[PDB]
Amino acid sequence: AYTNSFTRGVYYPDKVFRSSVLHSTQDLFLPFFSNVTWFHNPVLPFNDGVYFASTEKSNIIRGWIFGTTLDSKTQSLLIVNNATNVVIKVCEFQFCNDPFNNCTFEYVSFKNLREFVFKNYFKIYSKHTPINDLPQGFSALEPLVDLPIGINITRFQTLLAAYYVGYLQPRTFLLKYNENGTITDAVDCALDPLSE
Amino acid sequence: TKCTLKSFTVEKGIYQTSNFRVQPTESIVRFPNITNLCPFGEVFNATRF
Amino acid sequence: SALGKLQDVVNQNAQALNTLVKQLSSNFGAISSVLNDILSRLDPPEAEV
Amino acid sequence: FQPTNGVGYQPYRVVVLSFELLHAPATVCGPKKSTNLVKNKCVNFNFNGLTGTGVLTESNKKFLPFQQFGRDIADTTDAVRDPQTLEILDITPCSFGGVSVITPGTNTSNQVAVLYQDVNCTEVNVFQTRAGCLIGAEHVNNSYECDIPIGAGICASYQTSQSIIA
Ligand SMILES: *[C@@H]1O[C@H](CO)[C@@H](O)[C@H](O)[C@H]1NC(C)=O
Ligand SMILES: *[C@@H]1O[C@H](CO)[C@@H](O)[C@H](O)[C@H]1NC(C)=O
Ligand SMILES: *[C@@H]1O[C@H](CO)[C@@H](O)[C@H](O)[C@H]1NC(C)=O
Ligand SMILES: *[C@@H]1O[C@H](CO)[C@@H](O)[C@H](O)[C@H]1NC(C)=O
Ligand SMILES: *[C@@H]1O[C@H](CO)[C@@H](O)[C@H](O)[C@H]1NC(C)=O
Ligand SMILES: *[C@@H]1O[C@H](CO)[C@@H](O)[C@H](O)[C@H]1NC(C)=O
Numbered sequence A: 001a002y003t004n005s006f007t008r009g010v011y012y013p014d015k016v017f018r019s020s021v022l023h024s025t026q027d028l029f030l031p032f033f034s035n036v037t038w039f040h041n042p043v044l045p046f047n048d049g050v051y052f053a054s055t056e057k058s059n060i061i062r063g064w065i066f067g068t069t070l071d072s073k074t075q076s077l078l079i080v081n082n083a084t085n086v087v088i089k090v091c092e093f094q095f096c097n098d099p100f101n102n103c104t105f106e107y108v109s110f111k112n113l114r115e116f117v118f119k120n121y122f123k124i125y126s127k128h129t130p131i132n133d134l135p136q137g138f139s140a141l142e143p144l145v146d147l148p149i150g151i152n153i154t155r156f157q158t159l160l161a162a163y164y165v166g167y168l169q170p171r172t173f174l175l176k177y178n179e180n181g182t183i184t185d186a187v188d189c190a191l192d193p194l195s196e
Numbered sequence B: 001t002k003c004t005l006k007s008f009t010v011e012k013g014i015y016q017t018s019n020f021r022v023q024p025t026e027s028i029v030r031f032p033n034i035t036n037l038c039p040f041g042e043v044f045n046a047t048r049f
Numbered sequence C: 001s002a003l004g005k006l007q008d009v010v011n012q013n014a015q016a017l018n019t020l021v022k023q024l025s026s027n028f029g030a031i032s033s034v035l036n037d038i039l040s041r042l043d044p045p046e047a048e049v
Numbered sequence D: 001f002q003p004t005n006g007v008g009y010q011p012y013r014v015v016v017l018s019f020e021l022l023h024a025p026a027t028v029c030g031p032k033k034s035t036n037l038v039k040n041k042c043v044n045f046n047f048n049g050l051t052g053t054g055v056l057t058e059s060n061k062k063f064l065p066f067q068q069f070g071r072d073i074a075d076t077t078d079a080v081r082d083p084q085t086l087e088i089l090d091i092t093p094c095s096f097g098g099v100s101v102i103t104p105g106t107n108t109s110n111q112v113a114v115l116y117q118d119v120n121c122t123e124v125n126v127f128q129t130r131a132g133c134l135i136g137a138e139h140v141n142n143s144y145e146c147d148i149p150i151g152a153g154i155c156a157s158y159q160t161s162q163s164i165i166a
Helices: C004-025 C035-041 C044-048
Strands: A003-005 A026-029 A034-039 A064-067 A112-119 A122-130 A140-147 A155-158 A163-165 A169-172 A175-177 A183-186 B013-021 B027-029 D043-046 D051-054 D069-071 D077-081 D088-090 D096-103 D113-117 D126-128 D132-135 D148-151 D154-159 D163-165
Touching: B013 D113, B013 D148, C035 C044
Parallel strands: B027 D043
Antiparallel strands: A003 A034, A026 A169, A034 A163, A064 A155, A112 A122, A122 A140, A175 A183, B013 D096, D043 D051, D069 D077, D077 D088, D096 D113, D113 D132, D126 D132, D148 D154, D154 D163
């Protein structure tokens, strides 16, 4: 199953504030009108990034799992929401093939679109938009977390509605900061002659 | 003026000589309120060694 | 669109100034584009080069 | 361990700290001194990451909750969020500019008048023109042909005991 990532996947690449200026930055973005893998369970690669999304109703999607060997041999990050708080751990677990040691780190605190971006240390961007089949349109992503865990990742999985998995690429864009400093529109600088 | 013109007489006019520049009076340093300290009270003031 | 000639003079000078300024952010084969940064990080003999 | 021994056999508690450095971004760092905040003076600031010299003034720009800097159309730092109390300050580079020396010919008199270019004339009998800070020339209400050009329509001349008028 597949679908077409129309216009989504744009995140404030840094922390500066710009007003009404058209900036031009080169980084890892999700190419426009790309191919998203429609899902509704297994592991997936981690080439250089992810555009994890979701169109959820009753929070079926709970959390993630990362790591190289995905079990006890290396460390493997684990983000989980067990209806209390987002209990992040980095303990080198022994995992189960159907879920739903030294810990160098820890923490404990269709109408939902929870867009997410992950990349490498570890950074996360998110956006939680009301919705009502991937809706076209535009929405930037605010950077909500950075984690200095130095883990080595090459694959990931999902805990347990539908979700979608992009894959970032090193492509130059053109961002339109509005007067409030809010990205309102972008132009993929290599999509087609008009865009070039 | 006499020195920049390399002359001992300067005919009437308006010449540019030097470069006015305020100097930075004092340095300043700012960092977020330091918190999240290490628990050395648990290593040194421990009940049993 | 009749006043393109004057608009052209203004635009040309603006672009020249903007390129001149943006040349400040280039390394030209050195370590860092900031001067004090090299003065602090690299030793004076290396900072000279 | 008997309490009546000497200090030679008396118990001692020992704690050994091993500072390991592997190629990781060094999470365990110490405290950083944060001086008081001064405004409206050409100061040499160093906010948490970035440095530079300026004149900090209370602004009215509205950053986003997570943004820290502000930049200009030419990619220059212009506004910094105070990382202790979240108030956004501007950054104005403290004034510089050329210095001109208006003069009648030395064949006439040894009197001159200085013109500091583009200053508020309070950062140095003292006239403030649309060109800069004129120092040493009377301000007449008259209007004569331009003898020595200055700028923005101002012209100075040596006239009547005599002096320099603008
Ligand atoms: C990839 O995208 C193309 C058009 O962009 C589409 O025709 C195709 O079905 C998508 N999936 C695969 C596996 O090619
Ligand atoms: C979620 O997990 C954490 C860690 O195991 C635990 O402290 C917390 O009680 C859990 N919450 C619930 C609702 O079970
Ligand atoms: C992570 O693993 C890859 C191979 O899977 C290796 O090339 C890379 O050097 C490793 N990096 C770290 C920091 O362990
Ligand atoms: C910018 O922010 C202000 C602050 O309330 C808001 O009223 C306005 O709608 C926003 N957008 C524009 C284009 O001004
Ligand atoms: C200019 O200098 C000469 C001397 O070389 C003198 O004779 C003459 O009177 C002077 N003229 C004025 C207007 O000062
Ligand atoms: C010069 O500075 C004073 C005091 O800071 C101020 O009141 C005055 O308006 C300034 N002049 C101009 C032309 O801005």
